[PDB]
């Protein structure tokens, strides 16, 4: 029972590695894409001005 | 009185011996019970975990 309990624990832990790494990569990419989109918006606004 | 003597020296020892044997058997089957419950927990956790991943 103890072995299977902390086996479920380590399985959840491995899922946690995968989820945390994916979330970190996704947020970094989202920040970079937001910076690029803001750059495009600002240079278009500058051209309009 | 002969029937009474059977009850208290033939039926009575038989029923006391049956009582100890049946109490030992009751102990036997509650140990069967908690061991079957422990296997129950084993299969329940195995099923829930394996379905989970």
UniProtKB/Swiss-Prot annotation, chain A:
Belongs to the NDC80/HEC1 family. The gene is NDC80. Component of the NDC80 complex, which consists of NDC80, NUF2, SPC24 and SPC25. The NDC80 complex is formed by two subcomplexes, NDC80-NUF2 and SPC24-SPC25, which are joined end-to-end through their coiled-coil domains. It has a rod-like structure with a length of 570 Angstroms and globular domains at either end. The NDC80-NUF2 globular domains are probably directed to microtubules, the SPC24-SPC25 globular domains to the centromere. NDC80 probably interacts with SMC1 and SMC2. Also interacts with KIN3. Interacts with DMC1. The chain holds residues 594 to 642 of 691 of the full protein. Acts as a component of the essential kinetochore-associated NDC80 complex, which is involved in chromosome segregation and spindle checkpoint activity. Present with 1160 molecules/cell in log phase SD medium. This is Kinetochore protein NDC80. It is found in: Nucleus; Chromosome, Centromere, Kinetochore.
Swiss-Prot record, chain B:
GO terms for cellular component: cytoplasm; DASH complex; mitotic spindle; spindle microtubule. GO terms for biological process: attachment of spindle microtubules to kinetochore; cell division; mitotic sister chromatid biorientation; positive regulation of attachment of spindle microtubules to kinetochore; positive regulation of microtubule polymerization; protein transport along microtubule to mitotic spindle pole body. It comes from the Eukaryota. Residues 19-49 form a coiled coil. It is found in: Nucleus; Cytoplasm, Cytoskeleton, Spindle; Chromosome, Centromere, Kinetochore; Chromosome. Keywords: Cell cycle, Cell division, Centromere, Chromosome, Chromosome partition, Coiled coil, Cytoplasm, Cytoskeleton, Kinetochore, Microtubule, Mitosis, Nucleus, Phosphoprotein. The modification Phosphoserine is found at residue 52. Component of the DASH complex that connects microtubules with kinetochores and couples microtubule depolymerisation to chromosome movement; it is involved in retrieving kinetochores to the spindle poles before their re-orientation on the spindle in early mitosis and allows microtubule depolymerization to pull chromosomes apart and resist detachment during anaphase. Belongs to the DASH complex SPC19 family. Component of the DASH complex consisting of ASK1, DAD1, DAD2, DAD3, DAD4, DAM1, DUO1, HSK3, SPC19 and SPC34, with a stoichiometry of one copy of each subunit per complex. Multiple DASH complexes oligomerize to form a ring that encircles spindle microtubules and organizes the rod-like NDC80 complexes of the outer kinetochore. DASH complex oligomerization strengthens microtubule attachments. On cytoplasmic microtubules, DASH complexes appear to form patches instead of rings. Present with 639 molecules/cell in log phase SD medium. This is DASH complex subunit SPC19. The gene is SPC19. The chain holds residues 56 to 108 of 165 of the full protein.
């Amino acid at each position: 029972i103890e072995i299977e309990k902390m086996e479920k624990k380590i399985n959840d832990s491995n899922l946690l590695m995968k989820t945390k790494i994916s979330d970190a990569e996704e947020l970094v990419t989202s920040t970079e894409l937001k910076l690029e989109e803001l750059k495009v918006d600002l240079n278009r606004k500058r051209y309009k001005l | 009185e002969r029937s009474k003597l059977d009850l208290i020296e033939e039926v009575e020892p038989l029923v006391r011996t049956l009582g100890d044997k049946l109490r030992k058997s009751m102990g036997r089957m509650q140990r069967e019970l908690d061991t079957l419950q422990q296997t129950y927990e084993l299969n329940d956790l195995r099923l829930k975990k394996n379905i989970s991943m």
